[PDB]
Amino acid sequence: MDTSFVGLTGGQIFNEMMSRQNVDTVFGYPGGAILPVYDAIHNSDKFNFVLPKHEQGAGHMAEGYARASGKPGVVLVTSGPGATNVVTPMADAFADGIPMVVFTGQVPTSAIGTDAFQEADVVGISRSCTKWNVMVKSVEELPLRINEAFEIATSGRPGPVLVDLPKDVTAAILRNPIPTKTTLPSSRAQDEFVMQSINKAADLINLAKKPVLYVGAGILNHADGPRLLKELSDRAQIPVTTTLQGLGSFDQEDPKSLDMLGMHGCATANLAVQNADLIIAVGARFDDRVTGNISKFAPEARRAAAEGRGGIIHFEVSPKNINKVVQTQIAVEGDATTNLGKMMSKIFPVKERSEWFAQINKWKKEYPYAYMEETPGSKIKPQTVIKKLSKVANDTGRHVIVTTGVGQHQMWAAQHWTWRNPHTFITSGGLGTMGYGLPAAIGAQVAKPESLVIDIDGDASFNMTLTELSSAVQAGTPVKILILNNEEQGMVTQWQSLFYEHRYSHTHQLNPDFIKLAEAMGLKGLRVKKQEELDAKLKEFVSTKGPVLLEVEVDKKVPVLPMVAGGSGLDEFINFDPEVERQQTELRHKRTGGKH
Amino acid sequence: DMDTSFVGLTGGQIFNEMMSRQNVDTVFGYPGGAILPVYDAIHNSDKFNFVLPKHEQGAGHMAEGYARASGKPGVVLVTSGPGATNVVTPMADAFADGIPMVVFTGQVPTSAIGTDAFQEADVVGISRSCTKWNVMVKSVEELPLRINEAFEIATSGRPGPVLVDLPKDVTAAILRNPIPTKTTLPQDEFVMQSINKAADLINLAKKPVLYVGAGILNHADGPRLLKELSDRAQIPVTTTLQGLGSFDQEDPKSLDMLGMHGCATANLAVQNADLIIAVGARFDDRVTGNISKFAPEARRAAAEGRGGIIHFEVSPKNINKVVQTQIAVEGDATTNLGKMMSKIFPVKERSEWFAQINKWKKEYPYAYMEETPGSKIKPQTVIKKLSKVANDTGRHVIVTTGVGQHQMWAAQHWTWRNPHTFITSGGLGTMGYGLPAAIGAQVAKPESLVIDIDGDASFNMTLTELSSAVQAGTPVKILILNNEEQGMVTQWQSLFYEHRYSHTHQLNPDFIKLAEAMGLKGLRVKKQEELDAKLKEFVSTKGPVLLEVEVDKKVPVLPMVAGGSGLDEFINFDPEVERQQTELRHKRTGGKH
Ligand SMILES: Cc1cc2nc3c(=O)[nH]c(=O)nc-3n(C[C@H](O)[C@H](O)[C@H](O)COP(=O)(O)OP(=O)(O)OC[C@H]3O[C@@H](n4cnc5c(N)ncnc54)[C@H](O)[C@@H]3O)c2cc1C
Ligand SMILES: Cc1cc2nc3c(=O)[nH]c(=O)nc-3n(C[C@H](O)[C@H](O)[C@H](O)COP(=O)(O)OP(=O)(O)OC[C@H]3O[C@@H](n4cnc5c(N)ncnc54)[C@H](O)[C@@H]3O)c2cc1C
Ligand SMILES: COC(=O)c1ccccc1S(=O)(=O)NC(=O)Nc1nc(C)cc(C)n1
Ligand SMILES: COC(=O)c1ccccc1S(=O)(=O)NC(=O)Nc1nc(C)cc(C)n1
Ligand SMILES: CCCOP(=O)(O)OP(=O)(O)O
Ligand SMILES: [K+]
Ligand SMILES: [K+]
Ligand SMILES: [Mg+2]
Ligand SMILES: [Mg+2]
C-alpha cells in the first residue's frame, strides 16, 4: 500500500501524477466542473499551460504537440460543451494514431443521470473515437486510471484516450491508502513466432526482383525507424515510397526515393507499386486514399504470390489492421523498426537492380509533378509557392516543421515540398479536419520552441479556427501562417468540376481581410499577389521574428494532379495536360454562367 | 397505395423535394465529399434559402437560433467525419434545451462503412446520447420515410434534435421502384381527472405561485392562456431563464426569474408558497437550489393535504424525476390549461399574499454597485440602458447571449414582455452561442432587431462567424461587455477558491479592428459620458455592427444561491461588502486584480 497521497485532493493528486508521467505541457480551458483541478494546477511549476480560445483548438494543439515531440498531448477541459468541443480532435487523433490523453471535467457523481447543468455522456459519445475511456468513480482510483490512460495512449498503435473526472472526485480528499502499483507508471513462444515470420519475410525479400517499400507513419513511431529503413533500402537496393503520413521518414534527395503514392501520389510511385513483385508494407494501413480500386491494386505482387515468388509483407503493430484490406502473405507483428532491426542480418546484400531502376527512371522523366506554371500577367500558382517556400525554408538551416489545413494546398504541400527529416510534416489525413493547420502549428511550436514552424493553410480551412491567432500571441509561439488564398473550397470545387459538371454548390465563402485580421489579432500581416514580389515576401515571411501571417493570392480552379479516383487503379491516373486545362477552363466559364 | 412521383430521382433530388414538402424555407450547412450528391441536387434550389457558416458548429447554433425564433425546426446539412463531429456540441445543446433540429450528415458509401474509410465516423453511435433519435438511411427507397420520421420526432413531445446519416451511394442512387405513398407524406381519463383535481387544489390555494418554463412557449397560445389563468386566479408568476418572455414583466403579478441568480422575491415566494403550479419547467439544478430545501411550505401543505405541487409536463420521464409532485397533468401545457380554465374559480384578490410579496420587492431589488465619477462603466447599467434604447425603436426585438455573467445580467436587467425574444443556452450553457444564434434568429425574423449580448471570452469561441453574418445579409447587433476575463468562472474562483484565478484571463484581439476586418462596423465605449450616444448609434446602424463596452472587472452576479443553500438562503448585494472583497482580492493577487 501507498499512503503518500492521503490528505491530498483529487486535483492535487492529478497535478502530482502529471510530473510522474513526465508531462511538461497541458492544453486546456477552465470551467465549473473542472475547477478543483484548475485550482490545483494554479501557478504549478510542473508544466506549462496553454490556453486556446476554443476547446477544439486545445485538442488540435495537443495533436500537433504530440506529432512534433513524440510525447502524448494532454488536454484538460470542463464538462458539457467543454467535452463535446473536443470530440473532433479525438476523432482526428483516433484516425491518425496520435497519442493524446483527454481529461474532461464531469458533474458530481450524485448529479450524473439527472440531466444536470452542463452534463453530457462523454464516455458514451467518445467510445468510438478513443482507444479507451473511463469515468473515475472515486479519488482512490484516480492514479490508476491516469496511469492506464497514458499507457494505452502511447502503446500499440498510439491513439487518444479520455478520462472523465466528476467534480466531487477531484474536490475530494483521499482518506484511504491505495495500492503502490496503481500510483507508479508502467512470451518465448510469441518471440519465436515473430522471429519465424521475420525469417519468412527475409526469404521472400531475398527472392524479389522488383521490390518496393511502402512506408507509413508507423516507421516514425520509433527514433531509429528512418535509420533502419534507409539501411534496408540501401542493403537490398529497394526503392521507397511513403504515404502522406510517412513523408519525412525517407530522404527524398536519395536516388531510391519514389516520393508519395496514392490518389494524388507521384505517377512513378504508383506505377512501381502496380508493377512490383513484392510490396513490403512498413507502418502503413492500406487506406482507401492510397490503394485506389482495391481489386486493381498491386497486380504483379498478386501474380507473384500466386506463383509463390512474392506478394505482400506487412510490418504491423495492431492485429486490427492485419489482413483487413488485402490478403498479405507474411505479417510481422509488433513494432516495425524493432523488427526491421532483427531481420537485417538475414537480408542478402544486393549489388544492383539495373532493370528495375532503369524502368523506374524512365517513369521519373516521363511523369514529373507537372502543372501550369506562371505566365505574363497571370496570378501566382499555388504549386510554385510551395516549391519556392520549401527552398527558402530549407536554406535557413533551421529545423523546419510544416502543418497544413485540408484540401488542395495540403496535397500540393505534400507533393512539392522536399521531405528529408522525421517528424516535420504534421497534417490531418484520416479524418481530414479543416482548421487543423493553425492550432497544430501552435502545439508543434510549443513542443519545439527553436523550430521554424510553418502552417501551409487554405482559406476555407483557416476560417474554421482563425480565432486561435490570438492564442499564438498569448502562447509566445512565433508560427508562420501561410494562406494559399484561392477564395474557394478548392478540394470540393475540384470534385465538383470533375464529377458534377462544374456545379459549384455552396463551395465559395466570403473571406475576411486576412491581413487586417492578423493585425487585429496581434501579429504581423503580409500579403502578396504579384509574381515579381513573391520571393521577397517569402523571405520577409520566414525571417520575421514573432508570429506572422502571409496571404498569397493564387490562381483558382486549379486541379491537383496526377489523380486516381473512383474505380481507377493506381496506374490509371489522370495526368496534367496544359491543353486540357485550357479546354476545361472554357467549359467551366460556360457552365457556371461566367461566375467561375 | 404506391407512389412514383420520386421514381427516376436521385436520393439527393428526393432530399430537395422532401424539404419542400416539410415546408422548410432555410437550410444551414457546409459542403463536403460524402454529402456532395445532396449538394448537387440542391444547387440553385428555389425550394429554400441556404446559409453558409465558416464552421459546422456555426451552422448548428444558427439553426438553433432559427428554431427558437421561428418555432420551426432548424435544418442542418453537413458532410461525414469532421463535418459530423463538428456538430456534436450544437446537438448536445439542442438536446439539453429541447430545440427542434434535424441534422443531416453525409456518410461514406455503404460499401466503405466499417473499414476505417476516409472521413468515416460512427456518427450514429456518437450522437446517440445527444439526439432524441437517429438513423442511417440504408437505401434510397427509405429516404422519404426516414426524413418524415425525423421531422415528426424532432417536433413532437418535448422538441429535440434528431440525426439522419446519409451514405453517399444512397444519395447518389436513383429510385427505380415505387414506394408506399404513406412513407412519402409527413388514458384520456387520467388526464381529465388530473385536470379536475388540479383545478380544485388551485381554488383551495392561499399562497399560489406559477413556476413557468420554456414549455409554455411551445404553443402559440401558451403565453395568452398563461396570462388568463394568472389574471383569473390572481396568481404571481415567476419564470426560469428559458421562460423569460412568456409573461409580461410589466404586470404587477410578475415575480421575475427564480433560481441560482433569480430575483430574491421570486425565490422567497417559491419557498413560502403552499402550492406550486409548474408549467413547462423541469426543476433543473440551476432553479431548485438544494433540492431537500426546495419548496418547504409546499411540502408541508402537501403533508396536510391542502397544497403541494402541480406539474404540467409533456414528458412522463420528467415527472417526479427531481421532486415528488401531488398532481401530474401529462400532455401539452397550453392545451391542458385551456381545458382547466373553466374549472378555475375567479379570485378577486389576495391582499395578504400580495402584501408579503410587495414588501420583498421593495427590500430585495436587483441591487449592484452603480457608476461613480471616474469609475468604469458597470455591466448592469449597460443592460438597463440598452433595454430602453432598443425598446424606443418600436421594432420587434430579439436578444441572444453568450454564457456567463453578461448572460445572467441580460436576463435580470432587461424588461421581458414578448414570447420568443430571448434566445440563450441554458441547459448545456455553450459559450460562443451568441453570434451564430443571433444570425440564425435574424434569418428567421428578417425585420426584427437582433441583439447579441455577449462576453469577451464567449465571443472569442465563434467570432469567425462574423464574416458569415455579412455574407448571409444578417444585420445583427453584436454587443460585447468586455471585462477581459471569464467573469462567471472568476466569480466562483473568488467565492470558493480564495481568489486563485487559474487560467481565466485570455488575451483578447482588438474587437473593433476585428469587426472591420470581418466587414462590419465597429464601435467602442470606455467613458460613461459616451455610453448613451454610442448605444443609440449602435442600434441605429443599418448593417451588422459590433459595439465593445469596456466594463468593470471582477463584478459578481447577485443575488446568488449556490452549494447547499436553499432558494431563501441567497447572497444579497452589499456595497460595503464589495469594497471589502475588492481590497481582499488586491492583497491576494498582489494588485494584479
Ligand atoms: C484530401 C486528402 C487527400 C489524401 N490523399 C492521399 C494520397 O494521395 N496518398 C496518401 O498516402 N495519403 C493520402 N491521404 C491521407 C490518407 O487519408 C491517410 O491518412 C494516410 O495515407 C495514412 O497513412 P499511413 O497508413 O501511413 O498512416 P496511419 O493511417 O497512421 O496508419 C499507420 C499504420 O501503421 C501501423 N503502425 C503504427 N505504429 C506502428 C509501429 N510502431 N510499428 C509497426 N506498425 C505501426 C498502424 O497501426 C496502422 O496500421 C489524403 C488525405 C486527405 C485529407
Ligand atoms: C451561467 C448559467 C446560470 C444559470 N442560472 C439560472 C438561474 O439562476 N435560474 C434559472 O431559471 N435558470 C438558470 N440557468 C438555465 C438553466 O440551466 C436551465 O436551462 C433552465 O432553468 C431550464 O428552464 P426550463 O425548465 O424552463 O426549460 P427546459 O429545460 O427546456 O425544460 C422544459 C420542461 O418543459 C417540458 N415541456 C416542453 N415542452 C412542453 C409542452 N409543449 N407542454 C408541456 N410541457 C412541455 C419539458 O419536456 C421539460 O421537462 C442557468 C444557465 C447558465 C448557463
Ligand atoms: C458545472 O456544473 C456542475 O458541475 C454541477 C452540476 C449539477 C449540480 C452541481 C454542480 S456543482 O454545484 O459541483 N458546480 C457548479 O454548479 N459550478 C459552476 N456553476 C456555474 C453557474 C458557473 C461555474 C463557473 N461553475
Ligand atoms: C468523403 O469520402 C468518401 O465518401 C469515401 C470514402 C471511402 C471510399 C470512397 C469515398 S468516395 O469515392 O464516395 N468519395 C470521395 O472520395 N470523395 C471525396 N474525396 C476527396 C479527397 C475530396 C472530396 C471533396 N470528396
Ligand atoms: C463561462 C464564461 C465566461 O466568459 P465571458 O467573457 O464570455 O463572460 P462574462 O465575463 O460576462 O462571464
Ligand atoms: K516531394
Ligand atoms: K427583468
Ligand atoms: Mg481554398
Ligand atoms: Mg468576460
mmCIF file of N, CA and C in Angstrom, chain B residues 89-165:
data_model
loop_
_atom_site.group_PDB
_atom_site.id
_atom_site.type_symbol
_atom_site.label_atom_id
_atom_site.label_comp_id
_atom_site.label_asym_id
_atom_site.label_seq_id
_atom_site.Cartn_x
_atom_site.Cartn_y
_atom_site.Cartn_z
ATOM 1 N N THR B 89 -21.636 19.450 -30.474
ATOM 2 C CA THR B 89 -21.941 20.435 -29.450
ATOM 3 C C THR B 89 -23.327 21.046 -29.663
ATOM 4 N N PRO B 90 -23.634 21.502 -30.891
ATOM 5 C CA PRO B 90 -24.959 22.082 -31.135
ATOM 6 C C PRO B 90 -26.084 21.074 -30.854
ATOM 7 N N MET B 91 -25.856 19.807 -31.191
ATOM 8 C CA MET B 91 -26.867 18.783 -30.940
ATOM 9 C C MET B 91 -27.053 18.604 -29.432
ATOM 10 N N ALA B 92 -25.946 18.476 -28.703
ATOM 11 C CA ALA B 92 -25.999 18.320 -27.250
ATOM 12 C C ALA B 92 -26.691 19.539 -26.648
ATOM 13 N N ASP B 93 -26.446 20.696 -27.250
ATOM 14 C CA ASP B 93 -27.041 21.934 -26.775
ATOM 15 C C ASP B 93 -28.556 21.941 -27.013
ATOM 16 N N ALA B 94 -28.967 21.518 -28.205
ATOM 17 C CA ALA B 94 -30.381 21.467 -28.556
ATOM 18 C C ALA B 94 -31.095 20.389 -27.729
ATOM 19 N N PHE B 95 -30.384 19.304 -27.431
ATOM 20 C CA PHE B 95 -30.938 18.203 -26.643
ATOM 21 C C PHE B 95 -31.228 18.692 -25.224
ATOM 22 N N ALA B 96 -30.298 19.462 -24.670
ATOM 23 C CA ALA B 96 -30.455 19.985 -23.320
ATOM 24 C C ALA B 96 -31.611 20.971 -23.195
ATOM 25 N N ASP B 97 -31.772 21.844 -24.192
ATOM 26 C CA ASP B 97 -32.827 22.853 -24.168
ATOM 27 C C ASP B 97 -34.100 22.515 -24.953
ATOM 28 N N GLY B 98 -34.205 21.285 -25.446
ATOM 29 C CA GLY B 98 -35.392 20.886 -26.187
ATOM 30 C C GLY B 98 -35.699 21.695 -27.435
ATOM 31 N N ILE B 99 -34.696 21.873 -28.292
ATOM 32 C CA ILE B 99 -34.863 22.635 -29.525
ATOM 33 C C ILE B 99 -35.019 21.717 -30.735
ATOM 34 N N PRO B 100 -36.093 21.910 -31.522
ATOM 35 C CA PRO B 100 -36.331 21.081 -32.710
ATOM 36 C C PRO B 100 -35.236 21.296 -33.751
ATOM 37 N N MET B 101 -34.534 20.223 -34.098
ATOM 38 C CA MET B 101 -33.453 20.313 -35.065
ATOM 39 C C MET B 101 -33.280 18.993 -35.800
ATOM 40 N N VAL B 102 -33.139 19.069 -37.120
ATOM 41 C CA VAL B 102 -32.938 17.880 -37.940
ATOM 42 C C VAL B 102 -31.574 18.008 -38.590
ATOM 43 N N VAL B 103 -30.649 17.170 -38.139
ATOM 44 C CA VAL B 103 -29.287 17.190 -38.642
ATOM 45 C C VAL B 103 -29.055 16.105 -39.675
ATOM 46 N N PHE B 104 -28.693 16.521 -40.883
ATOM 47 C CA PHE B 104 -28.401 15.578 -41.950
ATOM 48 C C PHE B 104 -26.888 15.539 -42.106
ATOM 49 N N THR B 105 -26.311 14.354 -41.965
ATOM 50 C CA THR B 105 -24.868 14.205 -42.097
ATOM 51 C C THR B 105 -24.532 13.241 -43.223
ATOM 52 N N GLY B 106 -23.624 13.659 -44.098
ATOM 53 C CA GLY B 106 -23.220 12.788 -45.177
ATOM 54 C C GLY B 106 -22.416 11.662 -44.552
ATOM 55 N N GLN B 107 -22.352 10.524 -45.231
ATOM 56 C CA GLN B 107 -21.607 9.371 -44.740
ATOM 57 C C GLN B 107 -20.938 8.723 -45.939
ATOM 58 N N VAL B 108 -19.846 8.007 -45.693
ATOM 59 C CA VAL B 108 -19.133 7.329 -46.765
ATOM 60 C C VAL B 108 -20.042 6.243 -47.335
ATOM 61 N N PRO B 109 -19.753 5.771 -48.555
ATOM 62 C CA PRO B 109 -20.564 4.729 -49.193
ATOM 63 C C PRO B 109 -20.777 3.542 -48.261
ATOM 64 N N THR B 110 -21.949 2.917 -48.345
ATOM 65 C CA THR B 110 -22.247 1.762 -47.505
ATOM 66 C C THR B 110 -21.188 0.680 -47.698
ATOM 67 N N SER B 111 -20.560 0.663 -48.868
ATOM 68 C CA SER B 111 -19.525 -0.321 -49.162
ATOM 69 C C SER B 111 -18.177 0.041 -48.531
ATOM 70 N N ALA B 112 -18.113 1.181 -47.849
ATOM 71 C CA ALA B 112 -16.871 1.601 -47.200
ATOM 72 C C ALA B 112 -17.040 1.661 -45.683
ATOM 73 N N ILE B 113 -18.288 1.644 -45.227
ATOM 74 C CA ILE B 113 -18.586 1.690 -43.803
ATOM 75 C C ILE B 113 -17.997 0.479 -43.083
ATOM 76 N N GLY B 114 -17.304 0.738 -41.978
ATOM 77 C CA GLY B 114 -16.698 -0.341 -41.217
ATOM 78 C C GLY B 114 -15.283 -0.687 -41.648
ATOM 79 N N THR B 115 -14.697 0.121 -42.526
ATOM 80 C CA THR B 115 -13.346 -0.152 -42.999
ATOM 81 C C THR B 115 -12.360 0.953 -42.637
ATOM 82 N N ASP B 116 -12.742 1.834 -41.714
ATOM 83 C CA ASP B 116 -11.887 2.958 -41.332
ATOM 84 C C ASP B 116 -11.633 3.761 -42.606
ATOM 85 N N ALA B 117 -12.711 4.041 -43.330
ATOM 86 C CA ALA B 117 -12.633 4.780 -44.579
ATOM 87 C C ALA B 117 -12.313 6.256 -44.387
ATOM 88 N N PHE B 118 -11.933 6.893 -45.486
ATOM 89 C CA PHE B 118 -11.609 8.309 -45.498
ATOM 90 C C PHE B 118 -12.796 9.117 -44.963
ATOM 91 N N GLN B 119 -12.538 9.922 -43.939
ATOM 92 C CA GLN B 119 -13.557 10.752 -43.311
ATOM 93 C C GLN B 119 -14.770 9.976 -42.785
ATOM 94 N N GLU B 120 -14.547 8.757 -42.303
ATOM 95 C CA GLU B 120 -15.651 7.974 -41.752
ATOM 96 C C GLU B 120 -15.698 8.079 -40.233
ATOM 97 N N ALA B 121 -16.898 8.232 -39.690
ATOM 98 C CA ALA B 121 -17.076 8.299 -38.244
ATOM 99 C C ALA B 121 -18.348 7.540 -37.904
ATOM 100 N N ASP B 122 -18.412 6.995 -36.697
ATOM 101 C CA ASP B 122 -19.600 6.275 -36.261
ATOM 102 C C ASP B 122 -20.519 7.354 -35.689
ATOM 103 N N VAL B 123 -21.076 8.166 -36.581
ATOM 104 C CA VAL B 123 -21.948 9.269 -36.193
ATOM 105 C C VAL B 123 -23.212 8.851 -35.437
ATOM 106 N N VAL B 124 -23.802 7.728 -35.830
ATOM 107 C CA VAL B 124 -24.997 7.232 -35.163
ATOM 108 C C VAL B 124 -24.684 6.871 -33.707
ATOM 109 N N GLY B 125 -23.491 6.335 -33.472
ATOM 110 C CA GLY B 125 -23.099 5.972 -32.121
ATOM 111 C C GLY B 125 -22.740 7.192 -31.295
ATOM 112 N N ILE B 126 -21.966 8.088 -31.897
ATOM 113 C CA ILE B 126 -21.534 9.314 -31.241
ATOM 114 C C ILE B 126 -22.699 10.197 -30.794
ATOM 115 N N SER B 127 -23.677 10.376 -31.675
ATOM 116 C CA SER B 127 -24.818 11.240 -31.379
ATOM 117 C C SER B 127 -26.000 10.583 -30.674
ATOM 118 N N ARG B 128 -25.871 9.312 -30.304
ATOM 119 C CA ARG B 128 -26.970 8.614 -29.639
ATOM 120 C C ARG B 128 -27.471 9.329 -28.381
ATOM 121 N N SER B 129 -26.557 9.703 -27.494
ATOM 122 C CA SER B 129 -26.933 10.373 -26.249
ATOM 123 C C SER B 129 -27.307 11.853 -26.414
ATOM 124 N N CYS B 130 -27.135 12.382 -27.624
ATOM 125 C CA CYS B 130 -27.410 13.791 -27.933
ATOM 126 C C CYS B 130 -28.556 14.010 -28.905
ATOM 127 N N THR B 131 -29.324 12.968 -29.178
ATOM 128 C CA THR B 131 -30.439 13.096 -30.100
ATOM 129 C C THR B 131 -31.607 12.286 -29.575
ATOM 130 N N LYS B 132 -32.819 12.745 -29.853
ATOM 131 C CA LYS B 132 -33.992 12.019 -29.406
ATOM 132 C C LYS B 132 -34.038 10.727 -30.200
ATOM 133 N N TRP B 133 -33.476 10.777 -31.402
ATOM 134 C CA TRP B 133 -33.484 9.640 -32.306
ATOM 135 C C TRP B 133 -32.527 9.897 -33.468
ATOM 136 N N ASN B 134 -31.963 8.831 -34.019
ATOM 137 C CA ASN B 134 -31.087 8.958 -35.171
ATOM 138 C C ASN B 134 -31.178 7.673 -35.972
ATOM 139 N N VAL B 135 -30.684 7.707 -37.200
ATOM 140 C CA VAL B 135 -30.749 6.535 -38.058
ATOM 141 C C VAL B 135 -29.797 6.707 -39.227
ATOM 142 N N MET B 136 -29.520 5.608 -39.917
ATOM 143 C CA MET B 136 -28.670 5.650 -41.094
ATOM 144 C C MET B 136 -29.506 5.102 -42.242
ATOM 145 N N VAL B 137 -29.769 5.937 -43.243
ATOM 146 C CA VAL B 137 -30.557 5.511 -44.393
ATOM 147 C C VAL B 137 -29.774 4.448 -45.162
ATOM 148 N N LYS B 138 -30.357 3.257 -45.274
ATOM 149 C CA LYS B 138 -29.708 2.133 -45.949
ATOM 150 C C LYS B 138 -29.995 2.042 -47.446
ATOM 151 N N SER B 139 -31.083 2.658 -47.890
ATOM 152 C CA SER B 139 -31.438 2.629 -49.306
ATOM 153 C C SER B 139 -32.223 3.876 -49.660
ATOM 154 N N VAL B 140 -32.193 4.253 -50.931
ATOM 155 C CA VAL B 140 -32.908 5.437 -51.370
ATOM 156 C C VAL B 140 -34.422 5.273 -51.185
ATOM 157 N N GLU B 141 -34.903 4.033 -51.229
ATOM 158 C CA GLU B 141 -36.330 3.759 -51.065
ATOM 159 C C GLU B 141 -36.871 4.208 -49.710
ATOM 160 N N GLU B 142 -36.038 4.148 -48.679
ATOM 161 C CA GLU B 142 -36.474 4.522 -47.338
ATOM 162 C C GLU B 142 -36.146 5.960 -46.957
ATOM 163 N N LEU B 143 -35.528 6.696 -47.874
ATOM 164 C CA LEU B 143 -35.161 8.080 -47.600
ATOM 165 C C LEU B 143 -36.373 8.938 -47.237
ATOM 166 N N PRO B 144 -37.430 8.906 -48.071
ATOM 167 C CA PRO B 144 -38.615 9.709 -47.768
ATOM 168 C C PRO B 144 -39.173 9.373 -46.390
ATOM 169 N N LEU B 145 -39.178 8.086 -46.060
ATOM 170 C CA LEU B 145 -39.690 7.642 -44.770
ATOM 171 C C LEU B 145 -38.864 8.170 -43.603
ATOM 172 N N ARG B 146 -37.552 7.974 -43.670
ATOM 173 C CA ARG B 146 -36.676 8.421 -42.598
ATOM 174 C C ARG B 146 -36.737 9.924 -42.385
ATOM 175 N N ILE B 147 -36.846 10.677 -43.473
ATOM 176 C CA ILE B 147 -36.925 12.125 -43.369
ATOM 177 C C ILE B 147 -38.207 12.515 -42.644
ATOM 178 N N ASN B 148 -39.323 11.900 -43.032
ATOM 179 C CA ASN B 148 -40.602 12.203 -42.396
ATOM 180 C C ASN B 148 -40.610 11.836 -40.917
ATOM 181 N N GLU B 149 -40.005 10.707 -40.573
ATOM 182 C CA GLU B 149 -39.948 10.295 -39.177
ATOM 183 C C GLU B 149 -39.100 11.278 -38.376
ATOM 184 N N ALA B 150 -38.017 11.751 -38.987
ATOM 185 C CA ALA B 150 -37.111 12.687 -38.326
ATOM 186 C C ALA B 150 -37.804 13.991 -37.942
ATOM 187 N N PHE B 151 -38.447 14.638 -38.909
ATOM 188 C CA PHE B 151 -39.143 15.895 -38.645
ATOM 189 C C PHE B 151 -40.267 15.709 -37.630
ATOM 190 N N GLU B 152 -40.969 14.584 -37.714
ATOM 191 C CA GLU B 152 -42.053 14.333 -36.776
ATOM 192 C C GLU B 152 -41.500 14.194 -35.360
ATOM 193 N N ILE B 153 -40.481 13.356 -35.200
ATOM 194 C CA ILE B 153 -39.873 13.135 -33.892
ATOM 195 C C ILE B 153 -39.249 14.404 -33.304
ATOM 196 N N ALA B 154 -38.607 15.199 -34.152
ATOM 197 C CA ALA B 154 -37.962 16.424 -33.700
ATOM 198 C C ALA B 154 -38.968 17.472 -33.230
ATOM 199 N N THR B 155 -40.188 17.405 -33.754
ATOM 200 C CA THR B 155 -41.214 18.376 -33.391
ATOM 201 C C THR B 155 -42.304 17.867 -32.443
ATOM 202 N N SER B 156 -42.200 16.617 -32.005
ATOM 203 C CA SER B 156 -43.201 16.037 -31.103
ATOM 204 C C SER B 156 -42.753 16.008 -29.647
ATOM 205 N N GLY B 157 -43.684 15.672 -28.752
ATOM 206 C CA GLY B 157 -43.387 15.617 -27.329
ATOM 207 C C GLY B 157 -42.549 16.819 -26.955
ATOM 208 N N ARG B 158 -41.414 16.588 -26.308
ATOM 209 C CA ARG B 158 -40.534 17.702 -26.000
ATOM 210 C C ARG B 158 -39.685 17.811 -27.257
ATOM 211 N N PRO B 159 -39.714 18.965 -27.936
ATOM 212 C CA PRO B 159 -38.908 19.101 -29.154
ATOM 213 C C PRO B 159 -37.443 18.764 -28.872
ATOM 214 N N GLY B 160 -36.721 18.334 -29.898
ATOM 215 C CA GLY B 160 -35.323 17.998 -29.710
ATOM 216 C C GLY B 160 -34.608 17.721 -31.016
ATOM 217 N N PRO B 161 -33.295 17.469 -30.967
ATOM 218 C CA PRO B 161 -32.516 17.188 -32.177
ATOM 219 C C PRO B 161 -32.588 15.728 -32.611
ATOM 220 N N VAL B 162 -32.532 15.504 -33.917
ATOM 221 C CA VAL B 162 -32.523 14.157 -34.477
ATOM 222 C C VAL B 162 -31.461 14.188 -35.567
ATOM 223 N N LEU B 163 -30.862 13.040 -35.863
ATOM 224 C CA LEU B 163 -29.832 12.993 -36.889
ATOM 225 C C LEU B 163 -30.110 11.904 -37.906
ATOM 226 N N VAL B 164 -29.902 12.228 -39.177
ATOM 227 C CA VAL B 164 -30.110 11.277 -40.262
ATOM 228 C C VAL B 164 -28.799 11.152 -41.037
ATOM 229 N N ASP B 165 -28.186 9.972 -40.957
ATOM 230 C CA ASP B 165 -26.919 9.692 -41.625
ATOM 231 C C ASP B 165 -27.209 9.275 -43.067
#
